[PDB]
Symmetry: D2
Subunit: 481 residues, 4 copies
């Protein structure tokens, strides 16, 4: 009937139009209350107990903020209330597709359990959105508030995942192009989703966010770039933009890719793999689904949350023992041991199809050290992490358009060399982490010897503690000394 205000620790009092309220008060949306934003990160950062629900509320709020700001500052854009509401709904709903422990599910679990499939949290979000609309009678409420369900549901979906397939969009015409740069910016990655998680994740982790989104919004404009309307930033702000991405990198280095967080996500993925044949999830029309197939039926996926973890933990079934055990070793803090980190040298790169051959390589290394144990390939875990500014090797700032103070409607480009000599020369790199499943003293020592020798063989960078953990090995490599 009427609008609701919600108090958020990050954004303060957020105003929710009744349509948005109808959307969030559904099993499909409330589901996000039971999915950790950072998953295994909670087991390293105890403040990171926040869930995808609150983050979703924040994203919808900020999307509303940005579209409103653009509207008030440039009434010649013809932004309407329909537009604002659709942008807000896309903002609210672009996290609907995340599975248990967030990045754990689409990052590790699904690629292993369903490698024949190409699955993304985006597509999950489109499917869940469809299922929410259809299961909850949302369309007549949309029509009741001035929306046109065909066009606008199309628009929302396109905001979430991109062209559902010349102007490639059917949800909105060319003159409203800029609207697709708010929720998920596929042009340069600068969107309100990032802003919310910067602020929220920082608030919960105990790290401080250094990026000011309100300032960005206040300096944002729509300008014409190559016969298309885009969101441009003031020239002055280029530095801030670089810093924004630097911040993202920082957050990944400190929190999101923390080695123990990662190994915990790994162990949970392993347990889920071992439980997949024995856990059942009741989907549409009584049908039974498993963890790995819940994504085929949205009624089932609706009921796939962090809960499973606990179901495996509290299970009495013998067939779940293995699974139940791995989780139990997480509770006792008996985790796989971190052996080290290294990087490839030069423009050398490691391709994904080769990842699987890596633990065999490590165990196949021959350190000239006397060892009482010999470890095998399956005693090693090798996590390959690609760190980049969101556009592979590309500088995302090269894909931002700027406007100057004398001519607010004339878009310009700014090159890196126009800003600072202290900026990165590369915008992508790989980090290689090696762990050992054997956790006792001797096994760990051996694992370090194998690891450093393997780094030396592949001409990788010298591990930071190399001289300490493998003093009989590091002198061999002239390039290291």
């Amino acid at each position: 009937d009427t609008m609701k205000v919600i108090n958020d620790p990050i954004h303060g009092h957020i105003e929710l139009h009744p349509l948005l309220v109808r959307i969030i008060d559904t099993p499909q949306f409330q589901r996000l209350r039971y999915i950790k934003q950072l998953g295994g990160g909670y087991y390293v950062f105890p403040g990171a107990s926040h869930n995808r629900f609150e983050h979703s509320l924040g994203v919808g709020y900020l999307a509303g903020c940005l579209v409103h700001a653009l509207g008030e500052k440039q009434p010649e854009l013809q932004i309407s209330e329909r537009d604002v509401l659709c942008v807000q709904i896309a903002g609210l709903c672009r996290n609907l597709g995340h599975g248990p422990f967030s990045h754990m599910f689409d990052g590790r679990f699904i690629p292993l359990a369903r490698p024949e499939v190409k699955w993304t949290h985006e597509q999950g979000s489109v499917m869940m959105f469809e299922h929410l609309i259809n299961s909850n009678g949302i369309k007549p409420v949309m029509e009741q508030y001035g929306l046109i369900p065909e066009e606008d549901i199309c628009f929302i979906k396109e905001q979430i995942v991109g062209p559902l397939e010349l102007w490639p969009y059917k949800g909105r015409p060319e003159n409203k192009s800029f609207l697709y740069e708010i929720v998920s910016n596929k042009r340069n990655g600068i969107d309100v989703d990032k802003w919310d998680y910067f602020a929220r994740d920082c608030h919960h982790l105990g790290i401080q966010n250094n990026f000011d989104y309100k300032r960005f919004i206040k300096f944002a404009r729509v300008c014409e770039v190559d016969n298309e309307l885009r969101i441009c930033a003031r020239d002055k702000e280029v530095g801030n933009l670089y810093d924004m991405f630097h911040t993202r990198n920082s957050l990944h280095r400190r929190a999101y890719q923390h080695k123990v967080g990662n190994i915990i996500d790994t162990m949970i993925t392993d347990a889920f793999l071992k439980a997949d044949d024995y856990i059942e999830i009741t989907g549409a029309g009584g049908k039974k689904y498993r963890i790995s197939t819940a994504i085929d039926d949205m009624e089932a996926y609706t009921k796939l949350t962090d809960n499973i973890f606990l179901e495996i933990l509290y299970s009495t079934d013998p067939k779940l023992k293995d699974a139940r055990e791995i989780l139990k070793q997480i509770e006792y803090r008996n985790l796989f041991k971190y052996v080290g980190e290294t990087q490839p040298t030069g423009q050398i790169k490691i391709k994904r199809e080769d990842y699987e051959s890596l633990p065999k390589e490590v165990a196949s290394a021959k350190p000239k050290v006397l060892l009482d144990v010999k470890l095998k390939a399956e005693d090693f875990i090798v996590d390959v992490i690609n760190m980049d500014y969101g556009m592979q090797e590309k500088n995302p700032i090269d894909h931002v358009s700027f406007y100057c103070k004398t001519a607010p409607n004339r878009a310009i480009r700014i090159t890196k060399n126009q800003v600072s000599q202290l900026l990165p020369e590369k915008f992508a790199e790989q980090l290689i982490r090696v762990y050992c499943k054997k956790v006792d003293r001797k096994s760990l020592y051996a694992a370090r010897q194998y690891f450093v020798q393997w780094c030396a063989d592949r001409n990788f960078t010298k591990p930071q503690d190399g001289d300490v953990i493998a003093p009989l090995i590091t002198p061999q490599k002239k390039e290291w000394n």
Copy 2:
């Protein structure tokens, strides 16, 4: 085994002694990750996703800080490393006894499901602590780090629950009396648990804390009080102490007793009550327990967490339908409708044995106004809330000892009239919230009529919106104008 550092958003970097680490990494302790601090409050304040785990870490840390401060400022107290460790353990382990959704369980569920039982989260914390120790072989680790298990375990439990059985404590003699004022203050309720939940709940709820625990600790001393050594505060701080309780009251007014938060706790409690016969929880041996009898076997209670919500939510069994449905309504935001709040006048209390009878009274009122429907007692929920300063009718500051700059070893008392004329004249009051389970507009109108007629009948305070919700009744009461 060496110490570990944990980054907490509230307290920053927290140092954990290896014995504490050993205690934390148990299923009995890690269980607290799956119990929300404010339970139903999360469904009103989406920032409040925090659990009992992180709060527990905070309490342990704060206990450590206070004891260390006391020790270093006053070396004559013979505070030992053993003492510091035991106080830290007490702080860490005093939330182990909480149930699903915390307050909902000891405050609402257990009293209704087992009226004869006398359950407290303190007792549960003691039992769960015993269970942790004996299940994880902590005793030898304790003696490895210099504790004597038989005395120090007693000390810890006494810190949590009070005297198990003229000096009543067996863990420490009178000259260490002050040590029992740190983790759970039975004398005046000024303890580190409060400080942690003020800061933490405020950080998560998005409402802000005005109390400064660090200042308090800075000015904390131990002084002789009536044969005992007791923690005393600098005189100047008296105003800050009253304010502390004020803050507590405030936090209860805005968040913990939010009418809607409370009604959701109520709906969940009702759902658990209707699910109690059908949810089985395996304990020691394989003996099955219920949600309501889990508190009799710690191996089962270890597995009793917020998960039971989702269990009930995800169930399919017809026997669970009623319990499932309720939860589902919560998801759809079909909550019982708030009719209004009122208070009794004079020295007139609603005893507790009188609670159940209240809904009958509301339905028995005669509002001489045409009604589309008649309402019965089962259509009403009457929630009676006791707001106080933690010592019933008493003023806890009267039970605080102070010291002065000129003679910092002399305990004194400070009265209310010595502080301010603007303090509360009373320290305990009752709030009466009335809800109607019937949600339609007719039923709700009627419910407002019954409610205001009821308030008039027993000379309760006029509902704030009385003249607007029931204009045909309020004029019958001349003291309401």
Copy 3:
């Protein structure tokens, strides 16, 4: 001449219309950079380095926020861009009249240097506003942006000071009465000026503000209260409002009325008094003024800031010696010693005319103890402090209009007992601080004896440290023991 944006630590990025900018970039306004918000409080709280300038920007910002909110919510109020700019301007300029060290000047120095006159900071702000406008050619700029300066300048001045003197305002008609409730609220004291200083002062003091003005703004409406259009709060906000004033009180108890801060403001006031004959302030036509007479000429007052403090401190003129030495003592932290605090009892009220006679009364005590040295009226400082909720003995909440969810246009009233029984009985009280200019040990012992006896004879409250600093005098009362 475009909009400017200023980054504020409290409110983030504030937008400033070119008219506001033009007003701000004048010496009359920039003057505020050189006056401390809390004056001598900076000498107790090193974080309180903030000046009236930033506070002013904040007040203007918040005034804009509130008008914009009201207008966007209720378009039928006919709030014009003109109204918005005028409210903003009044927000910006209502601190123009503050003197050196703010409160020190109008509340201590001026009433002692010019006892004949009634000077307030409001009046100073209207005169300074007039001077700013007239000396900077603002009127045609006001006209350039659609203002009509006769009635609009009248309106701004009225917002600052009240009716210039049935509807007494000439700037805006009765139907816009609510506009007068934003910058300086004469009805209940709830205005945006308070909100800014709560947040700003807390930010700098190292104390946290627990009041949420954004929430209040979000719940504010305009309703008809006795043929008058007035700002009204949502009913359930009532608690927060009590808390608002509570916070004000605590802020005064913890910082603004800090005893050492007050004694430092007293010593500075004294030094200014001893320098008043010798300092020359140049005004219009080259006429010279003193510190106490600069208020008579806005050109001179424009150059009357905290600068004076240093001019005295750095001076070599022997005429200034006395003054100078006082300040030097402050630098050496040789302050008058704090003797103690006490309050009147029953229905006793310390009248202002009596304030002068109190040092004699104290010195005219007769304790009956050993005494080395006798003290005189000269040696004593008696500071009487009036602590209230902004309306003397009245409850400001009784002068707030509320509205209920069910009928947002229908304004109602709410009594204290409709809220809580833990709220204050009285809403005004007096505090009595005694200091001694003789700082040695024997003299201080003396002063303490004198003081306690004086509390006994005038039936005052026993000072908190009574039993320790004067154990030979406390048993003589009765109601103290």
Copy 4:
């Protein structure tokens, strides 16, 4: 003479040993209350009202924190209470040398006024410190607390300015080498002074700090390196350390070197030059000094603060006409107009001896464009800014020693390529800002043509707005297209 507690918004309740209080409560130290930390920054960031005084308290506090942490974790270092006091004093007093508006004085004014001398705020701090010591009789107090003034005064000065000229320090022997890395780190610039200004400047500016000093402290140790005990950081903190210097750089980009802030500092500097002949500051033996010579007499320097600005602004002296006017043009916000920024390309670098020639080069540029007027050399201001990681062209992390989990007492080194490929390739650069003193539109258009052309001739980087403010010049340069 007891210990004091000060509430600081950044660090909370800081405690101060009475010797520290003795040093603090002097005109020499208290003088810092009247010198703004960021100077002209206040005129761009209104939150930046904070002074050198509170910063100094912060630095002393942090210095004590770090030396205490090291001592507590590593007893074998034999850190004495006396060491702690000396480090706290050095931390407290290392800002004594600062002049009016801080950086404005030592970075701009003195270089222009006194080109024949080499002045630094460090040298000034040592001088001011000696003056403080001698003027306030602190040597006997130092002795009262177990300090040995001959050794310890030298030690403190050495911490402030370096060796007063194998082991070149007289204050402490090699085995206390680490003690010189706390207050002013000449080895790599990682010190507690930076930490405090990071946190404090961020708190006041309204931009957020992402560096965690507490974390660094928790992970710091002392290890042997090249025959001396130095402060080593844990290996895994290397990223954080790089980020520390990024933060610093960022703070300079956004705030400290804000183009308007810098131009305001430049105008104030010019005013001071034009006022230097006429302002008198009386020092020792009533001897008068100029602003430019006050550094030659500590008694005079003690009275050289921000006050001078006001002294110039409030003057009536005809001789101070030209100075006063300039400051007045600051108040009316008639500042020099920012023409633009550029950088040198490649290895090319501008030596300071050439700075004065830069305005000439710009006016002597020949843009092939129509100019309505013609600008000369003195119509241009050219500001050259060196941005570095504090060690000119060197990577400071290459001068950081690290330690590993597995061998805490073994010091190691970590190279840039062992950390990341996304780090800076360069560690110093130059920014060149150009402003125009003539503010009219024609002059300014011309100034842009001149500036851009100058950039082209010098092979400088293209100004970010080049294609807009100078459409005719920019497409003539090949290196830009």
